[PDB]
């Protein structure tokens, strides 16, 4: 995910600690609160994409 | 050519062979006396079913005077598909505009 | 030529080689009748394996018949430059056009 595919990363991360919890921000809160209940997520056939 | 003034008169053949630009002033200078001594032989209604299979054969006459200006339509609705196994069949919604210059 | 009915018949030379302009028109047109008398050794999931490879090493072969019509690749973060001890490495976010007349 990380702009530098050159400098990997597997054990050491990029990111802020807030990132993930901007995320469980944006997805268990926001998005409810524009769902009334009508949205769902999706299993990806990357192969077919 | 058909005469519309007779029932037993209007076949498919009468009106495919006639053209669309020709359908038109064909019927509107006919007689607006009906004749009643000989009939149309499925009746007065059945005479309406003949001369509709004319028209429905006329735009794909229509079509082919037409296919120098449009293109192939590519299908419009997915299950349509050779491969569907490897991707998904598309649906045309079909906004395009049908043109050759 | 590989044949789009029979999954035995699909590798990345085959395909690379194809230009993706091609393949637009191959998966719509083949024949429906997927057959089963051939199987593929990676197994059938296997065989879209080798058709992405096919597709993704493709897009090289895209992109170098273009290769008159974008610019450089800038490096987008940093990072990516070599001399670092006095000015830093920029990240140049690309969303020019990229277009050579």
Same mark, same amino acid.
């Not at chain 1, 926001?30 to 994409?49: H, Q």
């Not at chain 2, 006639?18 to 019927?27: F, H, Q």
């Not at chain 2, 079509?63 to 349509?80: L, R, Y």
């Given at each position: 995910?990380?702009? @530098?595919? &050159? =400098?990997?990363?597997?054990?050491?991360?990029? @990111?802020? &600690? =807030?990132?993930?919890?901007?995320?469980?921000?944006?997805?268990?809160?926001?998005?409810?609160?524009?769902?009334?209940?009508?949205?769902?997520?999706?299993?990806?056939?990357?192969?077919?994409? | 050519?058909?005469?519309?003034?007779?029932?037993?008169?209007?076949?498919?053949?009468?009106?495919?062979?006639?053209?669309?630009?020709?359908?038109?002033?064909?019927?509107?200078?006919?007689?607006?006396?009906?004749?009643?001594?000989?009939?149309?032989?499925?009746?007065?209604?059945?005479?309406?079913?003949?001369?509709?299979?004319?028209?429905?054969?006329?735009?794909?006459?229509?079509?082919?005077?037409?296919?120098?200006?449009?293109?192939?339509?590519?299908?419009?609705?997915?299950?349509?598909?050779?491969?569907?196994?490897?991707?998904?069949?598309?649906?045309?919604?079909?906004?395009?505009?049908?043109?050759?210059?």
């Amino acid at each position: 995910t990380q702009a @530098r595919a &050159a =400098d990997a990363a597997d054990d050491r991360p990029h @990111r802020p &600690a =807030d990132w993930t919890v901007h995320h469980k921000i944006y997805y268990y809160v926001l998005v409810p609160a524009f769902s009334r209940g009508r949205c769902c997520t999706a299993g990806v056939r990357f192969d077919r994409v | 050519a058909p005469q519309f003034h007779r029932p037993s008169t209007i076949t498919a053949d009468n009106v495919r062979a006639l053209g669309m630009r020709g359908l038109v002033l064909a019927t509107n200078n006919a007689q607006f006396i009906m004749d009643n001594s000989y009939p149309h032989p499925h009746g007065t209604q059945g005479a309406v079913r003949e001369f509709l299979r004319g028209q429905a054969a006329a735009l794909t006459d229509l079509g082919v005077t037409h296919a120098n200006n449009t293109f192939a339509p590519q299908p419009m609705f997915a299950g349509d598909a050779a491969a569907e196994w490897l991707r998904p069949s598309f649906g045309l919604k079909r906004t395009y505009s049908p043109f050759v210059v």
